[PDB]
Structures are given as C-alpha cells and as structure tokens.
A paper describes a structure:
In addition, the cap fulfills numerous other biological functions that are mediated by specific cap-binding proteins and include maturation, transport, and eIF4E-mediated translation initiation. Upon binding the cap, the eIF4E protein changed its conformation from open to closed, bringing the Trp102 and Trp56 closer to the cap, and together with the structural water molecules, stapling the ligand with the protein structure. Finally, to gain more insight into the consequences at the molecular level of N7-benzylation of the mRNA cap, we determined the crystal structures of three compounds with eIF4E. Overall, the comparison of these three crystal structures indicated that different benzyl substituents can be accommodated in the cap binding pocket due to (i) the conformational flexibility of Trp102, which was also previously observed for m7GMP analogs, and (ii) the presence of structural water molecules in the N7-methyl-binding cavity, which could be replaced upon introduction of larger hydrophobic substituents.
Crystal structures were refined using diffraction data to the resolution of 2.2 Å for 1a, 2.67 Å for 1c, and 2.66 Å for 1h. In contrast, in the complex with the 3-methylbenzyl dinucleotide (1c), Trp102 was pushed out from the binding pocket, disrupting the stacking interaction, which was most likely the cause of decreased binding affinity for this compound. In the case of the benzyl modified cap 1a, for which the benzyl ring was directed upwards, most of the structural water molecules were conserved in the cavity, while for 3-MeBn7GpppG and 4-Cl-Bn7GpppG the benzyl rings were directed downwards into the cavity, and the structural water molecules were replaced by 3-methylbenzyl rings or 4-chlorobenzyl substituents. The guanosine of 4-Cl-Bn7GpppG was not visible in the crystal structure, while the guanosines of Bn7GpppG and 3-MeBn7GpppG were stabilized by interactions with amino acids from the loop comprised of residues 50–59. Specifically, backbone carbonyl oxygen atoms of lysine 54 and 52 formed hydrogen bonds with N1 and N2 of guanine, respectively, and amide group (NH2) of Asn59 was a donor in a hydrogen bond with O6 of guanosine. For the eIF4E complex with 4-Cl-Bn7GpppG (1h), in which 4-chlorobenzyl appeared to be stabilized via polar contacts in the cavity, the phosphate chain could adopt two conformations, wherein one imitated the phosphate chain of m7GpppG, while in the Bn7GpppG (1a) and 3-MeBn7GpppG (1c) complexes, γ and β phosphates were shifted out of the pocket by 2–3 Å (distances measured between corresponding phosphorus atoms). Consequently, this weakened the interaction of the phosphate chain with the positively charged side chains of Arg157 and Lys162, mitigating the potential stabilization introduced by additional hydrophobic interactions of the benzyl group.
Residue numbers in the entry: 31 to 204, 212 to 217
Write the structure that this text describes.
C-alpha cells in the first residue's frame, strides 16, 4: 500500500490569505486558498505559494483546522489566545521563513502531545512595522495546555533562554496571560 497511497494527516487544514484593502471590510479581505489532509498535498501547496519573505506588507497567511475560521469571533477562538513572536526587519531575512515553516510543521505534525487538541491554527502577519507569528489556542484559562504549547513552541523555534515570549487572550487583544 505505501508505494501508492498518500500519507494522511491527523487533521484537515485550511490555508487562508489576507490582503489589506481599505475599500473593503476586514472580513471581506479574508480569502481561503485551499484545504488539504495529506503530507503530499501540503508540500505541493507550500511549494506553489509565495514565501512570507516575499509578501507585500499588510498581508497574512493563516493555517487553521477545518471548521475553525481565522477570526477571533469563532466559537473555538473567542475564549482562547495566542503565543506571540515578534520579528524585526533583520529577523524577516534571517528567521521569518524558518519560523513559519516550523510553525506549520508543529501544527500538521501534532507536536504538542495531548494538548495538540487545543491548537486552532497559526497566523503570520507581514507588516512594515514588524512581522508577527502566532499559534492560536482554544482556551486561555487552560494553564497546563497553554504553557506546554509555549514550551514546545519556543524550543522548536530554537529560541534561547534570553528571549521570552508572551501569551495573550484574544479578549484582551480586542497584557500577557503567561510567559515562557
Ligand atoms: C482580536 C484579534 C486578535 C488577533 C488577530 C485578529 C485579527 N483581526 C483583525 N481585525 C480587524 O482589522 C483591524 C486592524 O487590524 P490590526 O489592529 O491587528 O492592525 P494590523 O497590524 O493588523 O494591521 P496594520 O497595523 O498594518 O493597520 C494599518 C491600517 O489598516 C487598517 N485596516 C486593517 N485592516 C483593514 C481592513 O481589512 N480594511 C480596512 N479598510 N482597513 C484595514 C488599520 O485599522 C490601519 O488603519 C482590527 O482593529 C480589526 O478591526 C479583526 N476583526 C475581527 N472582527 N476579527 C479579527 O479576528 C480581526 C484579531
């Protein structure tokens, strides 16, 4: 079988694109690119789309589980939050692509052990004032789930102990609940 069957992923994922157009509302600028649920289809999609290094400022990439929209209003997002990573212009050249791909691999590979059910998706923001990468979780009050994801994430990215990342509730964003 392995010689001809695609390798299924634990979850089905949806990749979203966002471009900032002042003529439209924020929700109207969200566009769904494609959905995938196999290892082969992910790499086909990833190799066909632009790297975030080469996106114009004001655009976003979002990878979310099928059934969860890239909105904080979503049922699985309103009571949750995100682990935030801030990038300067030097990091856009050095780390932007590596961190986003590692983020994608942490989602589709289910790298967070039992707490991978609390992951909702990931977002990279390409802005002129600085780039951001976030992993969204479903419940901000689950200290065990949120902090374990933060520890696994920070080690996966290779961040040194001198750097600290913060987790912010989406309700507050519209302060850091935890830091790791
Ligand atoms: C809570 C949360 C947590 C994490 C992520 C999100 C994502 N999110 C973001 N928004 C809305 O989008 C506004 C600006 O977004 P941000 O405040 O995050 O600012 P950014 O850094 O993203 O962008 P920018 O600094 O380069 O801004 C540059 C200039 O463009 C204006 N602008 C930005 N976009 C649009 C747009 O789409 N059309 C128009 N005409 N102008 C826009 C900005 O105002 C500024 O004048 C924000 O207030 C909200 O209304 C959301 N809305 C709902 N309902 N749900 C969400 O989940 C959500 C939300």
């Amino acid at each position: 079988p392995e010689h001809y069957i695609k390798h299924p992923l634990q979850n089905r994922w949806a990749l979203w694109f966002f471009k900032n157009d002042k003529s439209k509302t924020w929700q109207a600028n969200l566009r769904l690119i494609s959905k995938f649920d196999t290892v082969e289809d992910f790499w086909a999609l990833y190799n066909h789309i632009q790297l975030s290094s080469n996106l114009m400022p004001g655009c976003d990439y979002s990878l979310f589980k099928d059934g969860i929209e890239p909105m904080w209003e979503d049922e699985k997002n309103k009571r949750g939050g995100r682990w935030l990573i801030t990038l300067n212009k030097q990091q856009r050249r050095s780390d932007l692509d590596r961190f986003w791909l590692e983020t994608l691999l942490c989602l589709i590979g289910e790298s967070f052990d039992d707490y991978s059910d609390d992951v909702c998706g990931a977002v990279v923001n390409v802005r002129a004032k600085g780039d951001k990468i976030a992993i969204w979780t479903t419940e901000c009050e689950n200290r065990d789930a949120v902090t374990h994801i933060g520890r696994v994430y920070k080690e996966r990215l290779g961040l040194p102990p001198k750097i600290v990342i913060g987790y912010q509730s989406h309700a507050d964003t519209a302060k850091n609940r935890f830091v790791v």
